[PDB]
Structure formats: C-alpha cells, structure tokens
Swiss-Prot record:
GO terms for molecular function: aminoacyl-tRNA deacylase activity; aminoacyl-tRNA ligase activity; ATP binding; metal ion binding. One of its GO terms (biological process) is tRNA aminoacylation. Monomer and homodimer; the dimer is less active in tRNA editing and does not have a zinc ion associated with it. Another report shows only a monomeric form. PANTHER family: ALANYL-TRNA EDITING PROTEIN, ALANYL-TRNA EDITING PROTEIN AARSD1. Gene3D superfamilies: Threonyl-trna Synthetase, Chain A, domain 2. Zn(2+) binds at residues 9, 13, 116, 120. Its cofactor is Zn(2+). Binds 1 zinc ion per subunit; the homodimer seems not to bind zinc. The zinc is probably not catalytic. Another report suggests the zinc is catalytic. It comes from Pyrococcus horikoshii (strain ATCC 700860 / DSM 12428 / JCM 9974 / NBRC 100139 / OT-3). This is Alanyl-tRNA editing protein AlaX-S. Changing residue 30 to V: Significant deacylation of correctly charged L-alanyl-tRNA(Ala) occurs. Functions in trans to edit the amino acid moiety from mischarged charged Ser-tRNA(Ala). Has little activity against Gly-tRNA(Ala). Belongs to the class-II aminoacyl-tRNA synthetase family. Editing domain AlaX-S subfamily. GO terms for cellular component: cytoplasm.
Length: 152
C-alpha cells in the first residue's frame, strides 16, 4: 500500500538485479530510469539485443525476487565510507553530484546495490507482479531499454 510510483521505483532495483543475473557484468551500468504511474523504464549500457529467452528469464527472475519478499535495506553513510564498502558498482553512469557527502545506499542482498535517495517499499513483495512490455536495443548508443509495468 505504497503509492504506485514508490512501488514502481522499487521495481527498478529488482529489475536491474535480474538484468545483471541474466546478462552478466557487461550490463551492470544503469544509464537512466523513468517512472510514471505503474510504468517504468530501465536503460543500461549494453552491447547487444538480448534473446527472447534472456528477456523471458529477466522477467521470471524479477518476479521470483518479488515473491521472495526480501527486505529492501537502506544505508545512510558518509560518501567515502559507502565507496569503501560498495565500490563503483553502487553508482550509475551519471555521478551523484560531488557536493553530496551523505549518501543513502539501497541494498537488496545478493541482488542489487545502488546509491538512491528516493522512497522505496520495505520489502520486494510490496512491489507486486512485474511484466516486461518492451525491450529496445539502441546499437548506435550502446544502450538497452527495458520497459515494464506493475499489475496493480
Ligand atoms: Zn531507488
């Protein structure tokens, strides 16, 4: 019972984790994301159009994580300490403004770690079913787009 957008924003972290499990470290860098209502889009740097099989697996794993109802942990830490603890992987391609010394790090254990200060659900179960609507690879930009939506 969080707003729909809070659930969708939380889904981005679950979807990213699935993307990395399926596609590997080559897709670990988020370029951008966007949420509107129950719809979201995750854009990561990648070098090819995933196969229908890979796409189906990303969706399955995302939903499996939701069903597990794992906790979505938030750690507030000095920026340099977070860097020592999590390394470069907690960041996306657009660096957090340099003046930010207090960082909030979102952790879904063994799934995804990301510096993000937005509101999130407390557990992955609160997100609800996730459906991948469209996947688009922009060869010229080296970016992979994953469009999805929440069933509630
Ligand atoms: Zn977030």
């Amino acid at each position: 019972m969080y707003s729909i957008e809070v659930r969708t924003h939380s889904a981005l972290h679950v979807v990213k984790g699935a993307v990395v499990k399926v596609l590997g470290s080559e897709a670990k860098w988020t370029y951008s994301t966007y949420v509107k209502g129950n719809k979201g889009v995750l854009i990561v740097k990648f070098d090819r159009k995933p196969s229908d099989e890979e796409i189906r697996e990303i969706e399955r794993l995302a939903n499996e994580k939701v069903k597990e109802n794992a906790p979505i942990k938030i750690y507030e830490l000095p920026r340099e300490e977070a860097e020592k603890m999590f390394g470069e992987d907690m960041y996306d391609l657009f660096p957090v403004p340099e003046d930010v010394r207090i960082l909030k790090v979102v952790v879904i254990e063994d799934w995804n770690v990301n510096a993000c200060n937005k509101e999130h659900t407390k557990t992955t179960g609160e997100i609800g079913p996730i459906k991948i609507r469209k996947v688009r690879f922009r060869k010229s930009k080296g970016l992979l787009e994953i469009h999805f939506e929440l069933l509630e």
